[PDB]
Amino acid sequence: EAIVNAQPKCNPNLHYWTTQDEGAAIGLAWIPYFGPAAEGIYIEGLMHNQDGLICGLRQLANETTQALQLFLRATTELRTFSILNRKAIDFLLQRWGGTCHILGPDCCIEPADWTKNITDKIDQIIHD
Amino acid sequence: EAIVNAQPKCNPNLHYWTTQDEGAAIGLAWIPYFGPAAEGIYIEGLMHNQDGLICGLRQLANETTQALQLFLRATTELRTFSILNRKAIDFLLQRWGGTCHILGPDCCIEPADWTKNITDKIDQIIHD
Amino acid sequence: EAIVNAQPKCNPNLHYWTTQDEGAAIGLAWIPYFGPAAEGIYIEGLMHNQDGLICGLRQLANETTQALQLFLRATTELRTFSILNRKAIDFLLQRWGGTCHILGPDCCIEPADWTKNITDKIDQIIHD
Amino acid sequence: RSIPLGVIHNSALQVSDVDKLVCRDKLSSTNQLRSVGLNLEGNGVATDVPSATKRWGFRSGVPPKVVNYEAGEWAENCYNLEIKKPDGSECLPAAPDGIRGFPRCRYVHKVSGTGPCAGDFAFHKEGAFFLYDRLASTVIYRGTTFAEGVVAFLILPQGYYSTTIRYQATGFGTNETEYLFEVDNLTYVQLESRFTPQFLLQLNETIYTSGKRSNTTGKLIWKVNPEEWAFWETXXXXXX
Amino acid sequence: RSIPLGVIHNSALQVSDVDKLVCRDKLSSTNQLRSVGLNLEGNGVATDVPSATKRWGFRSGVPPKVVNYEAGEWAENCYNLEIKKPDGSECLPAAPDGIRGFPRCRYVHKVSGTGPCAGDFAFHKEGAFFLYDRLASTVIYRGTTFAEGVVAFLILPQGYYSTTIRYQATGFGTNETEYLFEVDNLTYVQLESRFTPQFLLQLNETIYTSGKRSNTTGKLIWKVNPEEWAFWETXXXXXX
Amino acid sequence: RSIPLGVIHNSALQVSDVDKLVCRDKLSSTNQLRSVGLNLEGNGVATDVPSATKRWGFRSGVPPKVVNYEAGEWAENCYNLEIKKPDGSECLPAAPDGIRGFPRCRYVHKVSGTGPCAGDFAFHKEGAFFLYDRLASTVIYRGTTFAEGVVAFLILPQGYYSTTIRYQATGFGTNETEYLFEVDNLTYVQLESRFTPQFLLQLNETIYTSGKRSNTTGKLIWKVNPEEWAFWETXXXXXX
Ligand SMILES: *[C@@H]1O[C@H](CO)[C@@H](O[C@@H]2O[C@H](CO)[C@@H](O[C@@H]3O[C@H](CO[C@H]4O[C@H](CO)[C@@H](O)[C@H](O)[C@@H]4O)[C@@H](O)[C@H](O[C@H]4O[C@H](CO)[C@@H](O)[C@H](O)[C@@H]4O)[C@@H]3O)[C@H](O)[C@H]2NC(C)=O)[C@H](O)[C@H]1NC(C)=O
Ligand SMILES: *[C@@H]1O[C@H](CO)[C@@H](O[C@@H]2O[C@H](CO)[C@@H](O[C@@H]3O[C@H](CO[C@H]4O[C@H](CO)[C@@H](O)[C@H](O)[C@@H]4O)[C@@H](O)[C@H](O[C@H]4O[C@H](CO)[C@@H](O)[C@H](O)[C@@H]4O)[C@@H]3O)[C@H](O)[C@H]2NC(C)=O)[C@H](O)[C@H]1NC(C)=O
Ligand SMILES: *[C@@H]1O[C@H](CO)[C@@H](O[C@@H]2O[C@H](CO)[C@@H](O[C@@H]3O[C@H](CO[C@H]4O[C@H](CO)[C@@H](O)[C@H](O)[C@@H]4O)[C@@H](O)[C@H](O[C@H]4O[C@H](CO)[C@@H](O)[C@H](O)[C@@H]4O)[C@@H]3O)[C@H](O)[C@H]2NC(C)=O)[C@H](O)[C@H]1NC(C)=O
Ligand SMILES: CSC[C@]12C[C@@H]3C[C@](C(=O)N[C@H]4CC[C@H](N)CC4)(C1)C[C@@](c1ccccc1)(C3)C2
Ligand SMILES: CSC[C@]12C[C@@H]3C[C@](C(=O)N[C@H]4CC[C@H](N)CC4)(C1)C[C@@](c1ccccc1)(C3)C2
Ligand SMILES: CSC[C@]12C[C@@H]3C[C@](C(=O)N[C@H]4CC[C@H](N)CC4)(C1)C[C@@](c1ccccc1)(C3)C2
Ligand SMILES: *[C@@H]1O[C@H](CO)[C@@H](O)[C@H](O)[C@H]1NC(C)=O
Ligand SMILES: *[C@@H]1O[C@H](CO)[C@@H](O)[C@H](O)[C@H]1NC(C)=O
Ligand SMILES: *[C@@H]1O[C@H](CO)[C@@H](O)[C@H](O)[C@H]1NC(C)=O
Ligand SMILES: *[C@@H]1O[C@H](CO)[C@@H](O)[C@H](O)[C@H]1NC(C)=O
Ligand SMILES: *[C@@H]1O[C@H](CO)[C@@H](O)[C@H](O)[C@H]1NC(C)=O
């Protein structure tokens, strides 16, 4: 379903912070001893509400909370870092967790170019 | 191989407890501040020995112990949460960790409907 | 690219230590209470510089450091155990993270034996 | 049911149905997945100290839980709590190893004081998280700056100034809590909900420049006279 | 070799061969995988305190290890140990953060007392685990209720009453350990292996109702006269 | 960019390009992946205490980080540091739970002494790691034996003697550090960079056998007279 922002207000601009693990360091800045303190490891950006994504994001995070809290209640792990990796695994199992039946609705295999590759050969055989 | 219970006794009924992370909460019960204490997060069930599964389970857990202990000896991680995720990864790598040769014994791709889809077209071409 | 050792020296022999989690224990040695102390869980080996692998390994670990340090800076996890599992996931997503177009450069599906299996049937149909 | 995952489709953000498989969906690596934190501020909740502290409460029997997140929003309002019981014992646990304050706060509201603290940990009464440095917790840690927020998970498509505002509190965490904005250690202003951070800072500067600070050893408390828009769209006595 | 994984096939539970690939096997998500804990009770081991404590022993040089598990079995018998050396120092480590007692126990056998405790941690001499709340440990934690058990891993197919029984122990963890069932702080019964929990509770009620508790400041110890089925299929002195 | 992964191809070790997909590459299980640690020793760095301690330095503001590794190299030289400020406070943190010394060291150089220690943690000035028991850290832990090294990641293709050498140090971690090799608690030798471990052990044996140890209550310090190959390819006074 599409996300329906139902909040009293929406800040349409997202002034954000994050990190980058592939950050091209100049010289010795990548060496922990020489690099930035904890407060200086952040990049910043500004994202506007094109396609309504900012207001969608606020509503999505809001709606995620119940399921995320119920997950945290049931785990005995003190700090959970594994949610995204598990989602990537589930993405793969959904498609490849069983036999893939070509042309069936649960098999992400495109035989188009192979069907056409075969089709060009039969037209050649008929010419013979 | 099939599991061979070789224990002195077997309790054929399994009165179990667990959690559910997708538990449909009524109202505010999903909010940690309002929800159950640590002692009340459990569901319960009772499973009988149909197909001998209970006695099989007791023997399986018994036989798992040596391999599980040797794994724990070799890891430096204090608390291991990753065994099932790693098994799902290995499940995928076993099938998709290399080129998949259709009709070969290590390629879980069924071309049946695609072979039949092609077969209906050739019979059409022969009719031409 | 190939690894180019550019170190002042190279020890061409690798006297190494590691563990084995599938170690066939004799009798009760797998039981933690009865097994070896922390200092005795190690196997040892000696590897020579065939194909220049030892000197390659020293240079590889050297060159890995910048990227590995930048990764550690950006994670809030105190101890990181997940790098290899994440790499196995990325290995799978690179090949199977989308629709697989047979005969296309990003689809690791070999239709050779299936194409030949079809080819033997058409030659049979032409004989009819 | 399961934890939702946001995805961009038809020029709009959607939640992907797990019961339906879309082969056109492409996930090329784990670097295409992101966890992100958004601030309750951005939804228009009141951010003044009196209104915000009413959303938190003490509870026993529920173990704390932490989840990481990788990107967050610059905050206008963050909070930092040093709350003790009347007998001097700490109400909040020391921050666990590796948990630092939320990294971008225009104003840090630092509240010191006392309350009954009838519970082992302080939770968000609406189920939101306390956002720290790329870690979200269900509970408040002592003396550690946080923003109120919530977490989302995404498949991606293929200077800094901070000012600390200090407050004293009695009856913290109750129906009838009392707050004082601190000008110096002997000069306080009765806090009202309607006081914005910018107003408190101007009130502080005009007290210093007018010489309305206490000039005795005793504590001077001012009450301010009478004199709907979100932050991004814009001895006792009396003073009018 | 590797950690076995149980799977249902031909109306029977099997261990899946890793060396053989079965394409008919369907794993549709990580929610189809489960780790489970089963109680040694269910295999018929003696559960009385004297028999059960003989299965545990102290050892140095081996770091403790924990593994999680997601579902477990209601226990008839659990244990909770407060053991000190004769000099008063603790024999068992405090429970690590986030480790709570096993969640379903009909009877908790709480043993207090002393032993030499010749080793840094207490391990299971048969390689079993100590089962806590969804965490299995190789070692015993102080004052924390556990069941003895073992762990399995599966691919799934596509009120509560607790009673604490208290005991004193000398020479805990040795060949010649002595156990006393505690009626009150001054009235004890010499424990035998053959005493079931239900018998100890009845023995306790008849001592209170008959007035056989100590009526001095001193310690009164009773010995009980002479008077193969598993739990699911069913001043010194003398008393006959 | 991303963390490199080593792979064997054309009889040579290569780094695999992520931007290029090779279908012939076979990864059959996670057991085919390995993290490994290699010792800076193996690249020819000077290993004497004076040269090696110049590669480490104290720094505040940077949180420590640990990463595991599964196999390592036997070391000729490891180090173990007990450094205090002049006022007696510890300069290094106690080893976290589960971090033990590097497991194979021919010589452990144990340095005790004092320095200013101007920073919360001691880091490697060249970005290398401190290798412990299958854990690599960016920082040095107190009293815990480590080797200097770096980590790699691989796709695999389809007795022990230790001797401790003890030293005293003043001005540890500075331009002008002073080191003394310890013969007994009252007999020391001025350390030079050129002194190999084997030489220090022979110097120690000839001092005991010649009776050049202190025979007073006071501290005796010897200076040794004048008398390019890597380890795998081979009261003050004077002594010539
Ligand atoms: C995701 O997004 C939604 C929508 O924005 C958020 O919904 C809010 O949910 C909370 C509680 O879950 C609501 O707060 C409750 O409001 C009830 C009635 O509202 C009063 O206030 C409004 C003004 O906002 C008036 O219009 C109205 O007439 C009421 O006077 C209260 O009765 C509740 O009271 C409880 O708490 C108080 C405070 O301690 C106690 O004194 C009471 O005894 C009682 O226990 C409560 O305050 C809030 O109104 C909802 N907002 C909206 C806009 O619907 C979600 O919270 C959000 N999810 C997350 C995780 O952030
Ligand atoms: C998986 O399932 C199997 C089968 O149920 C379990 O097997 C048990 O393994 C333990 C040890 O690993 C066995 O215990 C040992 O028994 C030896 C002989 O048995 C005595 O007792 C039996 C009655 O059960 C008598 O019939 C027999 O004649 C013997 O008198 C003992 O010699 C051993 O003694 C050791 O420990 C004692 C106690 O401290 C010391 O005094 C000794 O010096 C010595 O070190 C030991 O007690 C047990 O018998 C096995 N049971 C069965 C039915 O075979 C596995 O343990 C289980 N795996 C897990 C992880 O739970
Ligand atoms: C991967 O492999 C490479 C190659 O082996 C390693 O490269 C080394 O990198 C370090 C620093 O990153 C280099 O050390 C620096 O050397 C500078 C010049 O070298 C002096 O010494 C050499 C002898 O080795 C002389 O030939 C030369 O003339 C110089 O006299 C110094 O100027 C630097 O000084 C800094 O530190 C000192 C010590 O505290 C301070 O006093 C200074 O003020 C200054 O801050 C520094 O010492 C080293 O030379 C490089 N080696 C080679 C062979 O190139 C990588 O380190 C390695 N990666 C990892 C992670 O191990
Ligand atoms: C189109 S929605 C994808 C976004 C776009 C912006 C940058 C984002 C990001 O984390 N990029 C990262 C991706 C990895 C890269 N190595 C470094 C940059 C991805 C975070 C973001 C966001 C969302 C909510 C709250 C805070 C921040 C803003 C959502
Ligand atoms: C056919 S064998 C699969 C079982 C069946 C029962 C329920 C199980 C379970 O954990 N279901 C969960 C699955 C996730 C769901 N969101 C909540 C319920 C799965 C646990 C169980 C068992 C086994 C051994 C010890 C204790 C418990 C009993 C094994
Ligand atoms: C051809 S390069 C693969 C190597 C070969 C040797 C054994 C290795 C290993 O860890 N084998 C393990 C694999 C799992 C098995 N259950 C037990 C043995 C794999 C480690 C090694 C190495 C590398 C650098 C530093 C130290 C050690 C040396 C690299
Ligand atoms: C205390 O709080 C309750 C609930 O918010 C409220 O009804 C009551 O009026 C408050 N004051 C007193 C004195 O109870
Ligand atoms: C104000 O009080 C605080 C705490 O009581 C103290 O740390 C600070 O130094 C005081 N400031 C002045 C100017 O006295
Ligand atoms: C209040 O005003 C004084 C006068 O400049 C200033 O030093 C102080 O920092 C101000 N307080 C705040 C919270 O800005
Ligand atoms: C002394 O304090 C009073 C009340 O705070 C104030 O009105 C007066 O101006 C002060 N005197 C000064 C600042 O000299
Ligand atoms: C102590 O234990 C050992 C071994 O279980 C046993 O042989 C011995 O008889 C016991 N008693 C004494 C006094 O040693």
Ligand SMILES: *[C@@H]1O[C@H](CO)[C@@H](O)[C@H](O)[C@H]1NC(C)=O
């Ligand atoms: C019995 O002793 C325990 C510990 O010595 C104590 O905590 C408890 O209060 C005592 N009970 C009575 C009734 O004295």
Ligand SMILES: *[C@@H]1O[C@H](CO)[C@@H](O)[C@H](O)[C@H]1NC(C)=O
């Ligand atoms: C023993 O009997 C008394 C009398 O009712 C009771 O209060 C006590 O709890 C009993 N002890 C146990 C362990 O049940």
Ligand SMILES: *[C@@H]1O[C@H](CO)[C@@H](O)[C@H](O)[C@H]1NC(C)=O
């Ligand atoms: C006093 O104690 C004795 C021995 O325990 C018992 O036989 C007697 O009945 C007691 N007296 C009472 C309970 O009045």
Ligand SMILES: *[C@@H]1O[C@H](CO)[C@@H](O)[C@H](O)[C@H]1NC(C)=O
């Ligand atoms: C101290 O160290 C610096 C930098 O290594 C060096 O230049 C200086 O000569 C040393 N000695 C003194 C006395 O500063």
Ligand SMILES: *[C@@H]1O[C@H](CO)[C@@H](O)[C@H](O)[C@H]1NC(C)=O
């Ligand atoms: C030498 O000194 C150390 C520490 O000061 C001490 O532990 C050790 O016992 C001493 N050795 C002798 C032989 O006195």
Ligand SMILES: *[C@@H]1O[C@H](CO)[C@@H](O)[C@H](O)[C@H]1NC(C)=O
């Ligand atoms: C130095 O020599 C004495 C004499 O044998 C010996 O006991 C001592 O251990 C030696 N020290 C070292 C570090 O080997």
Ligand SMILES: *[C@@H]1O[C@H](CO)[C@@H](O)[C@H](O)[C@H]1NC(C)=O
């Ligand atoms: C006493 O000490 C001196 C200097 O260390 C040494 O020359 C002499 O041989 C010693 N006497 C002995 C060992 O009897």
